Structure 1
């Protein structure tokens, strides 16, 4: 007689993203398929010396939120989206991969107050239901991609506490957190911040690095196993790490990638940093040759720079490749699909893993069985005719 309610929180790369590229078309989204939209991204005016976005270096706006023209214009369509789905909640996500300014914004009482005032101003001007902070990452700085300091852990908590106090009742405060095991251990006081957050979005993807083949495997592959311990990740492992650190499952949304990645293992030696004279003794070697890298290059994917491939492009360019160069497979342990390309020798080479309707439904089944609060996905612009979002909505009963 009583039915559970799951969330489906769809990121949309509207403004542009360092790794996913230019922003998409908000008009193509089906907002009836989701519960929450994270419009991405607000940026942060900052004094980091390595900032290359000159707009963000305006010293009169230090620590405030920056909204690009495209972001402003898209946020103007909110009334139309709300008419199509009057239950929809819309948040602005601030930060994203490579986004500077959190370490400075969070550092002092005065800096925190400026940031918070800016958050309040943006919520009010654009009539948002809340704010999502996507700081990559406190303390670690994504290994120097953004400035960081050890005080970031404590300061993130203070920032969230003070933002929670400032926000109107009813406004949502959320964050996205990293897959890396050091996130709950060292970077983010997850127990400390939990009281201030409506939910926590887990970035349970981007695992196709180092000696790992799969990008968003639910469990570890056995057929295509990761070699170095420090690289061995799955969505469930991440979930378990956050739960071990003291978060309740109902507060968590599992991140689902509407995209795939060509693993780094295909093109770069894989180093196990636990081994003797590690860099001279790689534990995997690249298996792509110029023949393979050229196929991807011709698609528009330069594997020396990036490995991201949107799901709609996987369908149109890989699955439906007129020359039939890609073969689709299912990994029964990892519960995701992957494609192989045939080497000149005739051997299948592992090309890319991704998510399809079947694997999305299996992640929804995990959400339901593990007792998580819902799904989050990156990102709506990468879906194919809203099919993966619709699958998620069907499987979660949204």
Structure 2
């Protein structure tokens, strides 16, 4: 009944030394490969050093498909850094056909089973380099339609079914800026990025993925919809069918340093910038939290029983960590089942080497 959609990051094949051969494919239904880029209106190889050459991640994913007939591998196009080409690609029938034909050509040449559209984000939002136009709201629908038609035609030619999915913002601005009731019919499933609700863009601490609204969290401009249940309910109301709605989970955490304790052990407090990270300041792999911080080395675990979220606080350094604890993740997996949702998605599989969260998701949703 349930999907388990794991993002694999191409750059895992650098210093992380986590290759597709390292994935336990028994723990997933789908791998989304992050990412393909857009160049001159076409889907292109994101990183020739690790994708179709060099470390040859694509070869490794095709090997995995042969070893695991259940497995479906999708190419994720865009993401935070590489979304700047979508607005142009979507804007005219000619641009949409050029884009869609390039997506089909890509999955045929590299052995993928479909396309995940990670457009961050239509109309407004995204990276400093991001490009938008008001017409994105309707053009997201039209680009999706062009892709679905091209993939239908190619699948009939190829004797295969090709999937078409999307990653959608946890922020309900995305719903205001799209037609989820019109476009849902062309996506096999919709990966809700029900995380990144709080982070070091705020000078104060908070939870990356609180389950429900905590009214005790009353910092400027951060309202009552920045939580998993609000995001799920918003997409259902917008016309995403429950069975297509896949709930995103983070396998990373965010950290701040120099957070005041207040009377909440550092929670919702003013801080002094990013805390320690794994591969960059302020961003921790679950592996690192689990090995080095979780009730370890002056970091103490606390549980917010309103938000249903765990955090770590080091009173000596004022470092605050938001991360996905098994206690929170079990609540989310029960919620998926209760609401008849499409399963779970996670960013990203390299960040949990002991498969603590990976195994809980697989145990609860697969059988």
> What is the CA–CA distance in structure 2 between the aligned matches of 1:117 and 1:40, rounded to whole Å?
20
Match of 2:73 among 85, 90, 93: 90
Separation in 1, partners of 2:166, 2:139: 15
Aligned to 2:95: 111
Cα distance in structure 2, aligned partners of 1:372 and 1:315: 29
Q: Normalising to structure 1: TM-score of the pair?
A: 0.79
Determine if the alignment matches structure 1 residue 71 to structure 2 residue 51. Answer: yes
The farther-off stretch of 163-172 and 250-259 is 163-172
TM-score, normalising length: structure 2: 0.85
| Residue among 288, 312, 323 paired with 1:313 | 288
**2:246 aligned partner:** 253
Within a 5 Å distance, the mapping from 1:265-276 to structure 2 comes to 266=259
For 1:15 and 1:374, the matched residues in 2 are separated by 26
Distance of 1:263 and 1:145 partners within structure 2 = 26
1:142 paired with 2:126, answer yes
Instruction: Select the residue among 11, 20, 39 that pairs with 2:33.
Output: 39
Show structure 1 runs of 5+ residues with no match.
47-61, 268-283
Shift of 1:82: 2.2
- Whole-angstrom distance in 2 between the partners of 1:353 and 1:194: 32
Q: CA deviation at 1:320?
A: 7.1
Instruction: Tell me the equivalent position of 1:225.
Output: 217
Q: Residue 327 of structure 1 aligns with which residue?
A: 300
- Is the contact made by 1:198 and 1:251 (CA closer than 8 Å) also made in structure 2? yes
Query: CA 1:178–1:117 in structure 2 vs 1: closer, same or farther (change >3 Å)?
Result: same
Q: State the Cα distance separating 1:125 from its structure 2 match.
A: 1.1
CA RMSD of aligned residues (A): 2.7
Q: How many equivalent pairs are there?
A: 344
Q: Distance in 2 between matches of 1:390 and 1:212?
A: 29
Task: Please point out which of 377, 382, 394 is paired with 2:346.
Answer: 377
Unaligned ranges ≥5, structure 2? 261-267
SS in 2 for 1:71: coil
Contact 1:357 1:388 in 2 (8 A): yes
8 Å contact from structure 2 (residues 298, 316) kept in 1 = no
